[PDB]
Amino acid sequence: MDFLFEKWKLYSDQCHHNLSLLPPPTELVCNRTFDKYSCWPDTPANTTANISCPWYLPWHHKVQHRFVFKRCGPDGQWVRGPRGQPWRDASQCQM
């Protein structure tokens, strides 16, 4: 139970840090972020970003070769959901 949370918090801490050491963007982007699921870099607007499924997932050894996707709008804004929350395509990563 908790152990999952602990691995998850580990993942977050690690991308909050991983992302400090980054150069400023040279173009219109979507600010880097931890959307509570995966760690995203600065992504150019109107493009879709990819990531290997996050490792805190219990089945990460079976989806290690899979990807999670997040769309960055032409706006320079990541696409949000129905209620405005962090949004993404993790179908590949689901059980």
Epitope: F5, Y56, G81, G84, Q94, M95
Partner: antibody
Framework: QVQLVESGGGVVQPGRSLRLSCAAS????????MHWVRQAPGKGLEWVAV????????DYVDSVKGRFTISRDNSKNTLYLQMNRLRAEDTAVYYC?????????????????????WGQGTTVTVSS | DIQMTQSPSSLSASVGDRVTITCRAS??????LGWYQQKPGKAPKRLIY???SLESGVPSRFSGSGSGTEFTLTISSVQPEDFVTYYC?????????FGGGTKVEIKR
Amino acid sequence: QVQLVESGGGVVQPGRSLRLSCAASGFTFSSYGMHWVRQAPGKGLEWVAVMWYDGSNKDYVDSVKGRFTISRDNSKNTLYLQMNRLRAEDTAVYYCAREKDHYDILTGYNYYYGLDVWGQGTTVTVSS
Amino acid sequence: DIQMTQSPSSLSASVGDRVTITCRASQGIRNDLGWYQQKPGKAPKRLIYAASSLESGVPSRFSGSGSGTEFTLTISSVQPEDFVTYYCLQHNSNPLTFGGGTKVEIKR
């Protein structure tokens, strides 16, 4: 006794600004999303604004976009509603409501449970 | 923008009647919906949550039903204090939307 208490209502001239407040008690204010709902005198209910923890997830009903600002002070468990460039349609009773959400780690989905607790309300009358 | 068509705007009842209030959502909203009662001069008070769940401390005569696009609020036998306004609220998508409301009036 979980409660919400609103203050700051009154008479304000069109064009001018008002600040509303919603004091909370009986619960941990930070762990919840807060809403504002208003009701013109003889009319029904209309959702106005909503914030969260971050608060990077603020939404407003179209008619108040760029005019109202919602904010919260977690140090003092209080919700605010900045009302600027007021006009006739803003005349109403304003309630504040509480809503619980839930983040699933495994699925990465966010679940919302709707508005469960309101305040007594506070009246805003726009007039010269 | 999800529309909540509520019916009827006002109805007529004698204590003991069964009252049925319908709410039709323009978009599938799964079960993210609640019914509200508002007594005159007072703030709304949720009765049904998650479409069919009953808030704790509410009479057993109130029941909600439906999912997706069609929802229903029922009062098995209207009571004297129940003759007041009722609202449905959708929390599926921003902005949040209410039905027009139903004013339940006692008949003579």
